[PDB]
């Protein structure tokens, strides 16, 4: 080999490290977004359960009202 071979080796290796780093950052962003969306789902399920309660009580009341 020579210095050219070692230099190209080093270059391609650095390239690999940068690609790896981009992959990493992508995974980090992934985890982040999924977490925030998780909180969003928390409040969604909250509103939904409240809605269910209200609907149930309403249905009971009308059901007792008709008869």
H helices of 1-67, where? 3-66
- Nearest to another protein of 1, 34 (CB atom): 1
**Cβ 12 to another protein, closest distance in Å?**
15
| Minimum distance of another protein from residue 3's CB (angstroms) | 3
Residue 13: partners with Cβ closer than 8 Å, 6 or more residues away:
none
The yes or no reply on residue 47 touching another protein (CB under 8 A) is no
26 touches another protein by CB under 8 A: no
CA angle, residues 4, 5, 10, in degrees to nearest 5: 95
């Amino acid at each position: 080999m020579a210095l050219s071979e070692i230099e190209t080796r080093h270059s391609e290796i650095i390239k690999l490290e940068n690609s790896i780093r981009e992959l990493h950052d992508m995974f980090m962003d992934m985890a982040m977004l999924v977490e925030s969306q998780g909180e969003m789902i928390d409040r969604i399920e909250y509103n939904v359960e409240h809605a269910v309660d209200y609907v149930e009580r309403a249905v009971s009341d009308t059901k007792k009202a008709v008869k």
